[PDB]
Design an enzyme around this catalytic site. Structure first.
Site, PDB file in Angstrom:
ATOM      1  N   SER A 159       4.049   2.621   8.000  1.00 33.07           N
ATOM      2  CA  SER A 159       3.885   1.517   7.096  1.00 33.07           C
ATOM      3  C   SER A 159       5.262   0.929   6.302  1.00 33.07           C
ATOM      4  CB  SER A 159       2.924   1.965   5.991  1.00 33.07           C
ATOM      5  OG  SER A 159       1.808   2.478   6.542  1.00 33.07           O
ATOM      6  N   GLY A 160       5.056  -0.341   5.977  1.00 33.08           N
ATOM      7  CA  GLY A 160       6.247  -1.000   5.558  1.00 33.08           C
ATOM      8  C   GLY A 160       7.387  -1.295   6.636  1.00 33.08           C
ATOM      9  N   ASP A 205      -0.675  -7.208   2.022  1.00 37.18           N
ATOM     10  CA  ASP A 205       0.072  -5.902   2.096  1.00 37.18           C
ATOM     11  C   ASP A 205       1.560  -6.351   2.188  1.00 37.18           C
ATOM     12  OD1 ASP A 205       0.588  -3.039   2.212  1.00 37.18           O
ATOM     13  OD2 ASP A 205      -0.751  -2.714   4.070  1.00 37.18           O
ATOM     14  N   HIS A 207       0.923  -1.437   0.070  1.00 39.35           N
ATOM     15  CA  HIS A 207       0.042  -0.090  -0.004  1.00 39.35           C
ATOM     16  C   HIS A 207       0.844   1.210   0.047  1.00 39.35           C
ATOM     17  CE1 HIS A 207       0.392   0.617   4.356  1.00 39.35           C
ATOM     18  NE2 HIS A 207       0.087   1.880   4.216  1.00 39.35           N
ATOM     19  N   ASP A 255       1.341   1.660  19.730  1.00 38.85           N
ATOM     20  CA  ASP A 255       1.070   1.021  18.456  1.00 38.85           C
ATOM     21  C   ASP A 255       1.779   1.665  17.557  1.00 38.85           C
ATOM     22  OD1 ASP A 255      -0.640  -0.215  16.281  1.00 38.85           O
ATOM     23  OD2 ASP A 255      -2.121   1.206  16.436  1.00 38.85           O
ATOM     24  N   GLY A 257       2.657   6.316   9.092  1.00 41.89           N
ATOM     25  CA  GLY A 257       4.110   6.537   8.601  1.00 41.89           C
ATOM     26  C   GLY A 257       4.931   5.551   8.738  1.00 41.89           C
TER      27      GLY A 257
HETATM   28  C1  LIG Z   1      -4.154   5.467   9.839  1.00 43.56           C
HETATM   29  C2  LIG Z   1      -5.750   4.848  10.032  1.00 43.56           C
HETATM   30  C3  LIG Z   1      -6.337   4.833   8.937  1.00 43.56           C
HETATM   31  S1  LIG Z   1      -8.047   4.165   9.276  1.00 43.56           S
HETATM   32  O1  LIG Z   1      -8.852   4.335   8.401  1.00 43.56           O
HETATM   33  O2  LIG Z   1      -8.181   4.236  10.516  1.00 43.56           O
HETATM   34  N1  LIG Z   1      -7.620   2.289   8.838  1.00 43.56           N
HETATM   35  C4  LIG Z   1      -7.641   1.913   7.420  1.00 43.56           C
HETATM   36  C5  LIG Z   1      -6.068   1.659   7.219  1.00 43.56           C
HETATM   37  O3  LIG Z   1      -5.395   1.353   8.209  1.00 43.56           O
HETATM   38  N2  LIG Z   1      -5.685   2.133   6.034  1.00 43.56           N
HETATM   39  C6  LIG Z   1      -4.443   1.826   5.612  1.00 43.56           C
HETATM   40  C7  LIG Z   1      -4.334   1.876   4.020  1.00 43.56           C
HETATM   41  C8  LIG Z   1      -5.355   0.758   3.438  1.00 43.56           C
HETATM   42  S2  LIG Z   1      -5.362  -0.920   4.154  1.00 43.56           S
HETATM   43  C9  LIG Z   1      -3.640  -1.231   3.577  1.00 43.56           C
HETATM   44  C10 LIG Z   1      -3.513   2.647   6.524  1.00 43.56           C
HETATM   45  O4  LIG Z   1      -3.675   3.840   6.850  1.00 43.56           O
HETATM   46  N3  LIG Z   1      -2.341   2.040   6.661  1.00 43.56           N
HETATM   47  C11 LIG Z   1      -1.354   2.588   7.427  1.00 43.56           C
HETATM   48  C12 LIG Z   1      -1.294   2.261   8.835  1.00 43.56           C
HETATM   49  C13 LIG Z   1      -0.399   1.576   9.492  1.00 43.56           C
HETATM   50  C14 LIG Z   1      -0.384   1.149  10.894  1.00 43.56           C
HETATM   51  C15 LIG Z   1      -1.569   1.261  11.667  1.00 43.56           C
HETATM   52  C16 LIG Z   1      -1.735   0.994  13.066  1.00 43.56           C
HETATM   53  N4  LIG Z   1      -0.676   0.076  13.739  1.00 43.56           N
HETATM   54  N5  LIG Z   1      -2.629   1.451  13.604  1.00 43.56           N
HETATM   55  C17 LIG Z   1      -2.748   2.035  10.971  1.00 43.56           C
HETATM   56  C18 LIG Z   1      -2.479   2.496   9.473  1.00 43.56           C
HETATM   57  C19 LIG Z   1      -8.386   0.471   7.467  1.00 43.56           C
HETATM   58  C20 LIG Z   1      -8.166  -0.284   6.019  1.00 43.56           C
HETATM   59  O5  LIG Z   1      -9.896   0.773   7.845  1.00 43.56           O
END
Ligand SMILES: CCCS(=O)(=O)N[C@@H](C(=O)N[C@@H](CCSC)C(=O)NCc1ccc(C(=N)N)cc1)[C@H](C)O
Ligand SMILES: *[C@@H]1O[C@H](CO)[C@@H](O)[C@H](O)[C@H]1O
Ligand SMILES: *[C@@H]1O[C@@H](C)[C@@H](O)[C@@H](O)[C@@H]1O
Ligand SMILES: [Ca+2]
Ligand SMILES: [Ca+2]
Ligand SMILES: [Ca+2]
Ligand SMILES: [Ca+2]
Ligand SMILES: [Ca+2]
Ligand SMILES: [Ca+2]
Ligand SMILES: [Ca+2]
Ligand SMILES: [Ca+2]
Ligand SMILES: [Ca+2]
Lengths: 191, 254, 142
Positions: free
Chosen positions: B192-193, B90, B41, B186, B190
């Site tokens: 991610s990956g 992912d 992603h 948590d 930012g």
């Molecule tokens: C930042 C939270 C956004 S959100 O709307 O609350 N959550 C969505 C999300 O994580 N979306 C993804 C992208 C599409 S699904 C791969 C994302 O933001 N990923 C980044 C991320 C990384 C870690 C965490 C965590 N540990 N809480 C949250 C988001 C999901 C799919 O509902």
């Protein structure tokens, strides 16, 4: 397969065995146990019994709180068990009056300090070794009217009418406890 | 990272910083001198594929030193089953144009065999997640690399302990939860990956990738990471494969 | 027990329940009171569950009310000490004692292995680096 259910803790003097249901049919089990911040350790690998001895694991620290889960095989299906804090929940075994000698108008009743499954320096620690001050012994006796005595050690020094005979019974007790605070009454002994 | 602490310079040596057009994009994990594992992603909105950069040995984004090594990302391999904007699969395998030099500040994390990771590492309670992501949900990102120790949960427990959010994404077999539900620690967007590294008998291994979750350190929710064990074979095969013409490559999975 | 005319003699715990098996009635004639008789009967009549010699592999049995407890030898465990701790050298059991990889083997014993950049020592379970910077190791701490 079917996830285990009715996971129950059977523990006495720290001899702790986890039991569950149902009687496996085309499915074996594997148990895992751990402390909240510890890693999961597996036990009773691919067993067909509906029980698992976890004594050796829980005696490593009886004041810790353990969680166990039973995996089912034809992530695998599983069921968590109730949390179990040995020190706070292990049943006290039935006591045994070790003896009693008379000394005029007094009688010393000794309660055999039974051993537990807690290994320490290649030996088995007694009930006293583990609970220390948290363990008391209560005495239920009568002139062979009820009578009772308590002691923070393993002996009772009581007064007795010279001539008459007496019968005794004792119970191990951890007052601070809420659940399983007393053991069953020991066998009756008469002087 | 939310609720963590600065990873002392050099103690998170496999951490990769991914930039696009010279801007902070995502985290990554070095697993050998040529390949970097990140999240698929992280590339949903990329347009200039020739402008992807991986930086190793980073630490403090506000101060340059000789431990930093930059390498153009020569290839981004994403599973054919992955759908931009959605949660499943992912993961991404990145080939660097030129190998990085292994040093005291730049070292690869071990990619473990499938069964080892499933039967042993998966039950090691705690693991480390890291990155330069947000320090608070919706807040600003970190200048210094952050690291956090989070506990792992089997999916049945995760689901049971997470408050049902109207039509939320399923936690598949290619995922796994980790973290706390009290809203204090948590990983975040930012990050991610970034790696979810597990320590086992003297050696660290790659068990997860920061992927998604409800907000960041939201009460009643856990972070979700890509379950790398499900991709060991997929990764190994690609690393032995010949480079392709274009940057982006979609490889079938399984 | 009751022999011809003995019942003419007053009750006796020793003569009747100690030196002999005594029924509930005979016990009741000694203690008289209801509760006292019961408190005595639960243990007296419970039987010795340790009589079956259930504790295997050199264990020690400790009798309890309608049950027992086995104290096993260090190398054993299980309700009856039936489990051999030394017979669990399989991978799922603590990674078979392997430092890195473990491979089960039907019949023979499990074999340990290592990740590229490491080699299995002569001990058969440990791995040591064969390169300057093996994966999963943090240089400034080694
Ligand atoms: C930042 C939270 C956004 S959100 O709307 O609350 N959550 C969505 C999300 O994580 N979306 C993804 C992208 C599409 S699904 C791969 C994302 O933001 N990923 C980044 C991320 C990384 C870690 C965490 C965590 N540990 N809480 C949250 C988001 C999901 C799919 O509902
Ligand atoms: C000895 O007696 C006990 C009584 O409970 C029984 O459980 C065992 O199986 C037997 O060996
Ligand atoms: C009872 O305890 C077990 C463990 C062994 O030590 C036996 O020899 C003893 O009688
Ligand atoms: Ca820098
Ligand atoms: Ca008689
Ligand atoms: Ca008689
Ligand atoms: Ca006699
Ligand atoms: Ca006789
Ligand atoms: Ca009668
Ligand atoms: Ca009689
Ligand atoms: Ca009679
Ligand atoms: Ca008995």
């Amino acid at each position: 397969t079917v996830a285990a259910y009715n996971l129950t803790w059977k523990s006495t003097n720290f001899k702790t065995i986890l039991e569950w249901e149902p009687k496996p049919v085309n499915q074996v089990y594997t148990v895992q146990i751990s402390t909240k911040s510890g890693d999961w350790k597996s036990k009773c690998f691919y067993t067909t019994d509906t029980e698992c001895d976890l004594t050796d694991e829980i005696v490593k620290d009886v004041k810790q709180t353990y969680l166990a889960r039973v995996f089912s095989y034809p992530e695998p299906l599983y069921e968590n068990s109730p949390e179990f804090t040995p020190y706070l929940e292990t049943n006290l075994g039935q006591p045994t009056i070790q003896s009693f000698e008379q000394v005029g108008t007094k009688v010393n009743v000794t309660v055999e300090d039974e051993r537990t499954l807690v290994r320490r320096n290649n030996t088995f620690l007694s009930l006293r070794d583990v609970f220390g001050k948290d363990l008391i012994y209560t005495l239920y006796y009568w002139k062979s009217g009820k009578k009772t005595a308590k002691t923070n050690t393993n002996e009772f020094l009581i007064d007795v009418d010279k001539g008459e005979n007496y019968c005794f019974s004792v119970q191990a007790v951890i007052p601070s406890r809420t659940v399983n605070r007393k053991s069953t009454d020991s066998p009756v002994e008469c002087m | 990272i939310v609720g963590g602490k600065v990873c002392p310079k050099g103690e998170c040596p496999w951490q990769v910083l991914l930039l696009v057009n010279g801007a902070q994009l995502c985290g990554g994990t070095l697993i050998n001198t040529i390949w970097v594992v990140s999240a698929a992603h992280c590339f949903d909105k990329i347009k200039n594929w020739r402008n992807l950069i991986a930086v190793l040995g980073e630490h403090d984004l506000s101060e340059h030193d000789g431990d930093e090594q930059s390498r153009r990302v020569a290839q981004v391999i994403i599973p054919s089953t992955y759908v931009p904007g959605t949660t499943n699969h992912d993961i991404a395998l990145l080939r660097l144009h030129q190998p990085v030099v292994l040093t005291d500040h730049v070292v690869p994390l071990c990619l473990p065999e499938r069964t080892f990771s499933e039967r042993t590492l998966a039950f090691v309670r705690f693991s480390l997640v890291s990155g330069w992501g947000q320090l608070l949900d919706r807040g600003a990102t970190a200048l210094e690399l952050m690291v956090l120790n989070v506990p792992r949960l089997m999916t049945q427990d995760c689901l049971q302990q997470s408050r049902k959010v109207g039509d939320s994404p399923n936690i598949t077999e290619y995922m796994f939860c980790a973290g706390y539900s009290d809203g204090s620690k948590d990983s975040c967007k930012g990050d991610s990956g970034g790696p979810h590294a597990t320590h086992y008998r003297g050696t660290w291994y790659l068990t997860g990738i920061v992927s998604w979750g409800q907000g960041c350190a939201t009460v009643g929710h856990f972070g979700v990471y890509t379950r790398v064990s499900q991709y060991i074979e997929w990764l190994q095969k690609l690393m032995r494969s010949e480079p392709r013409p274009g940057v982006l490559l979609r490889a079938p999975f399984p | 027990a009751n022999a011809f005319l003995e019942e003419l003699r007053p009750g006796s715990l020793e003569r009747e329940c100690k030196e002999e098996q005594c029924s509930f009635e005979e016990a009741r004639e000694i203690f008289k009171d209801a509760e006292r008789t019961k408190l005595f009967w639960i243990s007296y009549s419970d039987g010795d569950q340790c009589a079956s010699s259930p504790c295997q592999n050199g264990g020690s049995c400790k009798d309890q009310l309608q049950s027992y407890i086995c104290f096993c030898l260090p190398a054993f465990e299980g309700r009856n000490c039936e489990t051999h701790k030394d017979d669990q050298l399989i991978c799922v059991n603590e990674n078979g004692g392997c430092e890195q990889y473990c491979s089960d083997h039907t019949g023979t014993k499990r074999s340990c292995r290592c990740h590229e950049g490491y080699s299995l020592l002569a001990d058969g379970v440990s791995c040591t680096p064969t390169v300057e910077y093996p994966c999963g190791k943090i240089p400034i701490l080694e």
